Design a protein around this ligand. Sequence first.
Ligand SMILES: [Mg+2]
Ligand SMILES: [Mg+2]
Lengths: 124, 124
Amino acid sequence: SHMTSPFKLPDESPSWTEWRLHNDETNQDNPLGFKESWGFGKVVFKRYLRYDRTEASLHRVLGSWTGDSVNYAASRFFGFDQIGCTYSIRFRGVSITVSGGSRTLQHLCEMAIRSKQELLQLAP
Amino acid sequence: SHMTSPFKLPDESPSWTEWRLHNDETNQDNPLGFKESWGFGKVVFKRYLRYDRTEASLHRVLGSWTGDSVNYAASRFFGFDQIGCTYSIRFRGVSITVSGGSRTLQHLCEMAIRSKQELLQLAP
RNA sequence: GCUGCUGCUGCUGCUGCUGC
RNA sequence: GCUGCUGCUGCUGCUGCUGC
Ligand SMILES: [Mg+2]
Ligand SMILES: [Mg+2]
């Protein structure tokens, strides 16, 4: 039923071989990147994104979704009753989740973006 | 079995009558405060704190836990295997949760504090 | 990195009761 | 505001399998 995703960048999950190779070359503080997801009701969209802790890379992955792209994907699932909406992100052993009802989506996005930036800039 | 809390401020949950009164006087954007919790393994500590969106109030409630008060409370429950640790806060219809294993507690506290400040400064 | 599952706190949305 | 429950995605920790 091909769904519009909130994401503006394609998934970059490593293959199992690429993951083994990265592991032989390096440590949980320097993974290949991070995982993030958006959930609206019972539908979830997920991304693995490469991230290397540079300014350029930060800027690139911050661009993976916007308030507008989230609203566009989310509103496919809206009606009279509120549904639940959840952003989640995992990096270096820490998961941050931001959730609330669909009436609060704009506030959710604003808190999701700040969490994502702060987590990705976590000092080692 | 009276447990040491990660919290430095006592609970301020309103009574049902105080809540009804506040409701007659005012709207979900101006609650009496916020709720936060700290979970270590299966034990949870909770607080309802009064908050009025002023600088003085923000300063007061940011003092309800620190990295040290959290580590003191948490370490009671530690051993060789990791346990799961979770901070959560809810204000104005948004929940943030920050979790991970006991090996990442410091990082959890750093992210928890930032989420708490950002959420409590959420522009209406 | 992924799919699948077992035990174990918690979270969103909805639903109803307590005083309640 | 609280206690208790019903249905419904997700999250931490632990456990094992996939290629896997
Ligand atoms: Mg995730
Ligand atoms: Mg809570």
